[PDB]
Amino acid sequence: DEWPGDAGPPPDGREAALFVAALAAARPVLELGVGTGRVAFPLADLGVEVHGVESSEPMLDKLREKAAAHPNGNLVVPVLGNFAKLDLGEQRYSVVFAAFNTLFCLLGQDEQIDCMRQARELLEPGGTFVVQCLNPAGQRLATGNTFGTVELEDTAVHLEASKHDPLAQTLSAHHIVLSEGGGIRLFPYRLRYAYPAELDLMANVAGLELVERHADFERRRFDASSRYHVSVYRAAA
Template structure:
């Protein structure tokens, strides 16, 4: 995800959407997107809950960051663009929290400002009948498996990393998955209208076969 060919289209699109205005990143993390965006001359502020991630960010750049939850924390001032990348809204594990994230974005935006979300499409069509797990990546030294709880609309991504020995390191990431139509309704509840939806940051058409989307909402 840190490769230039992955990051540059994201930065290109966000810089264009910012149109010279101030930008706020929810869950800024280690600055994978924010640091190169700031290098373009865009004024970037962040909100981040993880102190270890902030420690990594501060080794790269001196960007203003508010420590807190992206659904409730407040950054100073108003912005022309708020954005969330790489499925991060799914880290909020209830529908109510996800709606509050939209409302928090609206509170930070100028009238007509935009909220951009990058999010995967739930891959329930790949689930075999009667099973609740699907392998999303299998390669040398790494195995990725998603397990689904379709009642609560939760999934857990399990990341198995293998070395030379017989043991593996396991990391887990719980999320609440969101269908595109549900995401649009969250936006409407917070005073947004869907402006565009594409399959990626370069503007490819979003279809029934798309595995992710970049959705741009405009504050009414």
């Protein structure tokens, strides 16, 4: 959205879109955690109908505003709510996806399994479930507390204070912005991450099976040093 450099959201909106589109089957897709449409609008540019779920009202409001002004806004269907509770009806989708750690916003393994399962049940035959998550091995997370520089601007610095518990597999952090004036903005967040093999087992429990894993949306080889992965799951035979 606004934040510059590494402080902003991952600059791969376009690539995510292409990726999902290629899996879309000219039919409609569901984005879990659609925010302000970082992936949804590029999707709309490729002629893909995107229903987007988002729990943050201020964010969804913005998506709606931008949609009104977007040449292809009409391909974007904003859905306000908590995914676990929304009744999406008889609607099925060709692709359900969750970009930039959205799945890991659910603060436990059981919640994540449940989520994968709701997504499974919304797929049409042959549909896929796609997630993009931090890859703990490649991310080399230190145990305990850390503090680091995220990005610099002429008149502000973006920093991060973080707490990592490698046993519970949680991260709790503030994104911090300090400004020349003396202003300070804190943006708290929390993740529970999964390791790839744990994640794959969760998917099985949820009735899903892994069909492919990459490091990123351009399909680069995934390996131990990959900071992220993009995983694609199908319903199990």
